Design a protein around this ligand. Structure first.
Ligand SMILES: [Mg+2]
Ligand SMILES: [Mg+2]
Ligand SMILES: [Mg+2]
Ligand SMILES: [Mg+2]
Ligand SMILES: [Mg+2]
Ligand SMILES: [Mg+2]
Ligand SMILES: [Mg+2]
Ligand SMILES: [Mg+2]
Ligand SMILES: [Mg+2]
Ligand SMILES: [Mg+2]
Ligand SMILES: [Mg+2]
Ligand SMILES: [Mg+2]
Ligand SMILES: [Mg+2]
Ligand SMILES: [Mg+2]
Ligand SMILES: [Mg+2]
Ligand SMILES: [Mg+2]
Ligand SMILES: [Mg+2]
Ligand SMILES: [Mg+2]
Ligand SMILES: [Mg+2]
Ligand SMILES: [Mg+2]
Ligand SMILES: [Mg+2]
Ligand SMILES: [Mg+2]
Ligand SMILES: [Mg+2]
Ligand SMILES: [Mg+2]
Ligand SMILES: [Mg+2]
Ligand SMILES: [Mg+2]
Ligand SMILES: [Mg+2]
Ligand SMILES: [Mg+2]
Ligand SMILES: [Mg+2]
Ligand SMILES: [Mg+2]
Ligand SMILES: [Mg+2]
Ligand SMILES: [Mg+2]
Ligand SMILES: [Mg+2]
Ligand SMILES: [Mg+2]
Ligand SMILES: [Mg+2]
Ligand SMILES: [Mg+2]
Ligand SMILES: [Mg+2]
Ligand SMILES: [Mg+2]
Ligand SMILES: [Mg+2]
Ligand SMILES: [Mg+2]
Ligand SMILES: [Mg+2]
Ligand SMILES: [Mg+2]
Ligand SMILES: [Mg+2]
Ligand SMILES: [Mg+2]
Ligand SMILES: [Mg+2]
Ligand SMILES: [Mg+2]
Ligand SMILES: [Mg+2]
Lengths: 260, 155
RNA sequence: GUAACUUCGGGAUAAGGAUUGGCUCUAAGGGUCGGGUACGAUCAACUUAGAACUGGUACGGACAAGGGGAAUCUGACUGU
RNA sequence: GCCCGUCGCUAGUACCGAUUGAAUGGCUUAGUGAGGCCUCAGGAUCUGCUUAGAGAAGGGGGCAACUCCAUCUCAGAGCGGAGAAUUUGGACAAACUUGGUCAUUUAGAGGAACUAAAAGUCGUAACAAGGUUUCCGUAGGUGAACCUGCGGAAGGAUCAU
RNA sequence: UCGGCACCUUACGAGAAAUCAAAGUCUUUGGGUUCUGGGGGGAGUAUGGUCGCAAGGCUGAAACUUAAAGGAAUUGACGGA
RNA sequence: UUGGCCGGUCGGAUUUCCAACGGGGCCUUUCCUUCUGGCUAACCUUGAGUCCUUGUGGCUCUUGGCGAACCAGGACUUUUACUUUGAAAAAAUUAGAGUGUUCAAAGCAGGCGUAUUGCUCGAAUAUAUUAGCAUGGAAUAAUAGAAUAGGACGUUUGGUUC
RNA sequence: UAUCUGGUUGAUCCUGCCAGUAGUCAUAUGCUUGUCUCAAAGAUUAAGCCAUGCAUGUCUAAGUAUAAGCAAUUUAUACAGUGAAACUGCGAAUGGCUCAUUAAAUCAGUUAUCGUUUAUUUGAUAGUUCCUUUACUACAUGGUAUAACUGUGGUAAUUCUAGAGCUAAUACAUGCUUAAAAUCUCGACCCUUUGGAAGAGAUGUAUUUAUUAGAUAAAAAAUCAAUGUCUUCGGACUCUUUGAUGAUUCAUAAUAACUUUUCGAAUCGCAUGGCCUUGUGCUGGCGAUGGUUCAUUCAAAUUUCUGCCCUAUCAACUUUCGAUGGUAGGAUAGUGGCCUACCAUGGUUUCAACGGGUAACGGGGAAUAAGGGUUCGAUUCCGGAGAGGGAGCCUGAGAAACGGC
């Protein structure tokens, strides 16, 4: 009421941040930024609740005000900065680079990448428009505006962003056969490229996706992120390759990998 | 609908920013803007070669169809360019595991491209708020026969 | 706008409340008028409604013109 | 044996009831109508300029081509901005007065019931063919239970000529 | 033979029983549908509405009170049978 | 898809020896709204050769190959109800997996070395119903259509706007 | 954990209630009470009233320091460190509390904005700044006017302020320098006509209007202002830029103008390199804070569909002063009877409208239940409303704000 909310209750935080129920009434409310409130990960949740590098919020502030962290190349000394999908966090001490990708349980896993892979990120094209003076641009999934794109770049494609200059190196179309990473819904964190795409004029285009163990699943088109062609993705993939084993297979693996 | 008395208001009735040049006498003599409303709905030829203005038409007017598509039965045609449709539905009470007949009366803008009598089933599309109560606009009239030609007087 | 009561006819103008001039306009409401073996001259009247403007907020401007209500006794009433 | 009512003491519960009863909360007609807002004006001031009159001050190349941006008395016809009080007409409208209507609570002389309720008084209406078979509808009469007329029922005291 | 008013026997069945060819085809619970009832009183009362000339009808509570009221059958006792 | 026997792993891979459940096509008079322009079909029709030792479980420059194994316009559509499956669905709570909070209510932690240049597992899953959206089915229950035929079907008139 | 038992009778079988019995994250109260973990708590009655104190302020290397403050500067005689006060910016619209109003209202799930605003974050983005160019003014950088402060006061009293004297800015108000091109409009100068030209100005981005483009099934031909550029003067002239959406008068571009002309850096810190006209000349790094527009995010506003307790001792309601719709306007951030003007006579209702009641905020949920259900949800999360009651408004991006008026 009366204006924008500045607080976030714990138990109103997104469940994938895995915040403990007690130890506070408040969750860190993500700032405005490239990603949404519920589709992202604040830097305090990444640096204290994932990497365990900081014990407090004051230690997260002390880490951030030393300009060690940087998200997507730029430094980002904001504690609740909304680092979301495809964002690259570079910690200069211990030379660590992370790409924020979903593990297949649907949560932001810690995925360590190399300095070559930290040079770029991927962006799903959200719209293609003409700006003023007739200049075309594309708008990606992280709020980037890139002027003068390739004229083959349409919506729901994926450009590769060079992150030293925000330029499109190459791009991947949306057509049958090419990998899909799933960035929402209940198939969140999955991989598996295609069966086809059904159109549904009026609303909510649907995509059929069939992973390497031949399990089909339908997702909305807005939850669908192209990561490459079938085999050789343009990014590295996390621990699990986005398969979503069932709970019996999970227990049959976990009993195996604890008795050596 | 090139006839039937378009200019019947205090103001001059025209489509906005559709200019007729009195100098250049190219053989059409009355321009007419139209669009296709989308979603697989035919633009009627009465809308094409009409002369009515109707700024709330889905084809020749300034409104767009987006959102809910509903169907209904026309129960009133007594307002000017507006009808009331009846949406009958069965509501489920879990306790008795049974249904009850409910109904909603939806006021719908009807274009003069459509000739609607009562007892007709129309398809209506959602638009922006047209009036206090109207939010839907007739996109398709789906009345075919009515079973009435064998009620006329014979020898 | 209009209560109790009622013989359902009344009570009732119940009770109460607004408006009203002048000037300048506007809109309605007629009669005569005619056709091919997509058409209006012309004539006349006072009713109603609305609007602007105007004024020492005056205006049924003199005249003319119900005080009302709640009850009781009594005779039904009109009448002599 | 059981049992019904009138009448009689005691207590409680609601009901009606003169009181234009009262209290409260809405909605509300009309009247008056604060306040701010928009608007019509208004101009205490508080200033930057310029002056065709004595402003005892260059017309920004130059004291002749009617052609070069040129400032202190002070009264001003030339201005320009800022602007308070006050103020005009609107819309919004608190609040008050008046009347209406609805919702809820509460006082009331007195009246008529019901219950506690078994005890008292008068009878014996019902249960037996309850001593006039009972009961229903209706009408009238009566201290009271009741009685009588008319039609009905059997839940009758007759499944039967 | 169809349709009707009923009757008689039996209890397959039903019921608390009396009884019932419907009061059966119900815990092995669903053919369709309307109306009514939720312990006894207070009470078919009060109030409001509505119909009627009226008598009245139709709709219709509550406070309060109560531990039973009732139904069917059995045995007994009693009867101006 | 229960398995089933080389029991040769001293009662522990298998497979047409198969029955019975559950799908997808084709033909039996059997619509799949219809053309276009991109596929060039388990290649309907097999120039050319079959060094494999017999069989009915394994192949090529092809003879213009039912250009019909899904992408976007229509001479384009009877409507539903029902039911299947799925998306999109706040957490907490509920059910429930894991885990000696010393037990338990809880919590979401923890566990394992060589504890000296630290390894590692989690924080699942289900339900979340009505209404809306998508999807398969076509019994059941409605509705529609050719009777005064203003009915249907015609790749090779193109006329009052086009 | 799908269970019954006592009570009508002399006894029986029932109908049927009363009573028992078990829970309550359900209250109160009585009696008793050693330990460990966990911790609800002035909801109900009075959204009744409040003494007192506190709950919203905030400064970095980086807006403004002549404190007549402190510490004692590091070519440091402009400043240099620290810094009260005050100006400026930002916040105070969040949180916390309560449940009074509220019955298609809130709310829930599901739509929509092709019907809108959006400080901030993030990304992109600005060579055009000259009136009527042949009437340019510092850009090596414009102007006054104020707090704090000094001093003189008023009042019993307030987070009251008056007069006078100073001085700043990222406050306020002004105001330039940042090519080259092309394309249009006007134009002193074409003889027997498909016969040409310097110059002068305008052209960024906002605003507002009008108009234009924003296309699109495969090929073809002769005519009538018209050699529409048909080069040996009829050797047919080999010709297509244009994005998105299911859908747009969309994005965007163009033309003519319009404007109490918007913006287009007169700001700050740290570092002080490079070059040759050694002038303290021309250049030059990392940031900070601003700024226009478009995106993005955080929102907001309105919105579609279906779903809410009891009551008919509520059956008709709404429609003068808007009810339902049309046209146009106004207002709005924008749609819209939202309001206005002029019209028309609609809109809803036994499938329960409208009215009344609620000891009703709604939902996620809770208690209990074999299953189906019944009851509760003021209360940890989400949404709404409110700050004694009404109403009105200022500021701001955002409030009809109440620790603002
Ligand atoms: Mg709040
Ligand atoms: Mg925040
Ligand atoms: Mg309207
Ligand atoms: Mg009167
Ligand atoms: Mg009277
Ligand atoms: Mg009046
Ligand atoms: Mg007059
Ligand atoms: Mg007398
Ligand atoms: Mg008399
Ligand atoms: Mg007595
Ligand atoms: Mg103002
Ligand atoms: Mg007797
Ligand atoms: Mg007697
Ligand atoms: Mg007797
Ligand atoms: Mg006797
Ligand atoms: Mg007798
Ligand atoms: Mg008697
Ligand atoms: Mg008699
Ligand atoms: Mg008889
Ligand atoms: Mg009886
Ligand atoms: Mg049986
Ligand atoms: Mg009962
Ligand atoms: Mg009873
Ligand atoms: Mg009565
Ligand atoms: Mg008996
Ligand atoms: Mg344990
Ligand atoms: Mg008894
Ligand atoms: Mg101890
Ligand atoms: Mg309280
Ligand atoms: Mg509370
Ligand atoms: Mg506080
Ligand atoms: Mg700063
Ligand atoms: Mg800020
Ligand atoms: Mg207009
Ligand atoms: Mg309008
Ligand atoms: Mg209108
Ligand atoms: Mg309606
Ligand atoms: Mg309440
Ligand atoms: Mg609730
Ligand atoms: Mg609640
Ligand atoms: Mg309460
Ligand atoms: Mg508020
Ligand atoms: Mg209070
Ligand atoms: Mg602010
Ligand atoms: Mg307020
Ligand atoms: Mg307070
Ligand atoms: Mg507050």
């Amino acid at each position: 009421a009366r204006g924008p909310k500045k607080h976030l209750k714990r138990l109103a935080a997104p469940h994938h941040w895995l915040l403990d129920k007690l130890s506070g009434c408040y969750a860190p409310r993500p700032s405005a930024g490239p990603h949404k409130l519920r589709e992202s990960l604040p830097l305090i949740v990444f640096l204290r609740n994932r990497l365990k590098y900081a014990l407090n919020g004051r230690e997260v502030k002390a880490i951030l005000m030393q300009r060690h962290v940087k998200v997507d190349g730029k430094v980002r000394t904001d504690t609740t900065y909304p680092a979301g999908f495809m964002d690259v966090i570079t910690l200069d001490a211990t030379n660590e680079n992370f790409r924020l990708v979903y593990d297949v349980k649907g949560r932001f896993a810690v995925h360590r990448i190399t300095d070559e892979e930290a040079s770029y990120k991927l962006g799903k094209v959200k719209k293609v428009q003409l700006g003023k003076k007739g200049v075309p641009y594309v708008v990606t999934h992280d709020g980037r505006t890139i002027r003068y794109p390739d004229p083959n770049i349409k919506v729901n494609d994926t450009v590769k962003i060079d992150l030293a200059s925000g330029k499109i190196t190459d791009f991947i179309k949306f057509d049958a056969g090419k990998l899909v990473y799933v960035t929402g819904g209940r198939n969140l964190g999955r991989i598996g490229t295609i069966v086809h795409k059904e159109r549904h004029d009026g609303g909510f285009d649907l995509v059929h996706i069939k992973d390497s163990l031949d399990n089909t699943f339908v997702t909305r088109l807005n939850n669908v992120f192209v990561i490459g062609e079938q085999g050789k993705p343009y990014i590295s993939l996390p621990k699990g390759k986005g398969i979503k084993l069932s709970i019996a297979e999970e227990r049959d693996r976990r009993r195996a990998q604890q008795g050596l | 609908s090139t006839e039937l008395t378009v200019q019947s208001e205090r103001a001059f009735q025209k489509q906005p920013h559709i200019f007729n040049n009195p100098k250049v006498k190219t053989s059409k003599r009355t321009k007419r803007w139209y669009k296709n409303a989308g979603l697989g709905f035919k633009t009627p030829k009465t809308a094409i070669e009409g002369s009515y203005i109707d700024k709330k038409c889905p084809f020749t007017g300034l409104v767009s169809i987006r959102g809910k598509i509903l169907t209904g039965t026309v129960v009133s045609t007594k307002m000017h360019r507006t009808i009331v449709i009846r949406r009958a539905y069965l509501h489920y009470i879990p306790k008795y595991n049974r249904y009850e007949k409910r109904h909603k009366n939806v006021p719908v803008h009807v274009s003069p491209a459509f000739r609607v009598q009562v007892g007709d089933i129309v398809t209506v599309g959602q638009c922006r708020p047209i009036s206090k109560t109207v939010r839907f606009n007739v996109v398709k009239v789906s009345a075919a026969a009515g079973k009435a030609n064998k009620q006329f007087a014979k020898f």
